[model samples]
Target: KVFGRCELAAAMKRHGLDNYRGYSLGNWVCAAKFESNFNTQATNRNTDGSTDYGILQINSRYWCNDGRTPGSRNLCNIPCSALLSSDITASVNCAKKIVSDGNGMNAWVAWRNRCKGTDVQAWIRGCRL
Candidate 1:
């Protein structure tokens, strides 16, 4: 597990993601919480047979290269297993790339369904910067 809200925020800040590309720390926190529960080892099999990878739950169909998934875009140029690590640098970087592809945080279904327009204040209510 990488974080529990505040620690994740701090880690993000330390990694220079506090206001990455106009997305707030709060946004990242809420999305991360919903997607992976702060667990880097998190993975979910989608209904379409694609798997979501890592803390951000990036999908194999469009992002990472998972050999099991044929016709993967592999936009991140990384193995899907790389996302399931305690060190979240690669995950974060890939997430940034995904957001940069024009969807912003909308790349994450969890963020769109759960965090968007929600009272995400609690996701980063405490802990020192």
Candidate 2:
């Protein structure tokens, strides 16, 4: 079975991150919020038909070798397959790379700073809306 919310949560914990999905969602949306809203399955009009895939928001054509397919199993492994894998740990491991692309966790750190917002606790206290 593909990894869903519960598995995704476990993966994030294994990777030593708190509220992983919440944090990751911010980055995903930032990358293409107006375009996909973090939908794993999204597409757009393109001659090459490269738009279509999962939350990783990858271009199916480029990741799937011009197949125009919309499944992580046939596309990129790290973010695409990992995020969708039944093994949540695998997903977290995959995201580690994207999070620390170059400067070592710089991307994750920076994005976290920008996306950090209050959750339910804060919401009840008027700290978040």
Candidate 3:
């Protein structure tokens, strides 16, 4: 349940375990929860031919351009596909790059706070399988 929140978080933790680790994963979940309530099938249009999809709310414009042939590279493809793949570690790693840089979860929290004005940390803590 939770459309992959618990599973995704656990997967993220397995890669790196710590409060910051949790925060990183939490940030991913934060974006998902606020964007689409962690729904893996979420979709929306960002531009004329661009779209957003998946739990991470990744733009199809970015992911779809990878030219993946369904099974190529095991990449997330449509963003939400990241949560469903057995190769979920890739998704965690992809998101980690963002975290390692500086955005952390606050980048995600900022977006949600602007629209929904909710504390993502409390939401992440509330997530359960």
Candidate 4:
């Protein structure tokens, strides 16, 4: 399920990402848009031999276990496949772990590249109105 802007915004808000980690919900929207284009099953391989999985693009290097990434820590413990599901709860919970780390949202280069220092409020304001 590829969520539209408002659909993602509403979903993230319901998941309690609205003010989690001191970032606005728009930040999450922008990250998802840039990272995965709201694609629930998106996957991208990193040059370092790891694959990014699902909507938030959680990396297999540390978050999810795919048994292919070198030196994987598998902190999220679940298989990377879980991240591809439309449920999103697994990915979201894994993202919380990523955020708690020193890198926080910067763990996602996409967020820093597209979301940081940008006003994303308009990215999904339609349905909220």
Q: Best candidate, lDDT-wise? A: 4
Local distance difference test, each candidate: 0.86, 0.39, 0.51, 0.89
> How many Å off is the CA of 83 in candidate 3?
6.1
Reference-based TM-score, model 2: 0.36
**Model 4 alpha-carbon drift over 4 Å, by segment:** none
lDDT preference between candidates 2 and 3, better one: 3
Candidates 3 and 4 compared: the better one by TM-score is 4
Compared with the true structure, what per-residue lDDT tens digits does model 4 show for residues 2-113?
A: 9988888888888878868888888888999999999999999989999999999998988899989878889998999999998988988998889889887898899999
Write model 3 residue lDDT over 1-129, tens digit each, in one string. 245667656655666623554453455555666666765556666544555545555544334433433332323333345543455454455555545556555434435474334554554475552
- Model 2, range 14-124, lDDT digits (tens) per residue? 556554434443233333233344343444545653443344434444343333444424323433443333343443444444554444333333234443352322212
The candidate that achieves the highest TM-score relative to the unseen native structure? 4
Model 3 whole-model lDDT (C-alpha atoms):
0.51
How far residue 41's Cα lies from its native spot in candidate 2, in Å, is: 7.8
lDDT of 4 at 38: 98
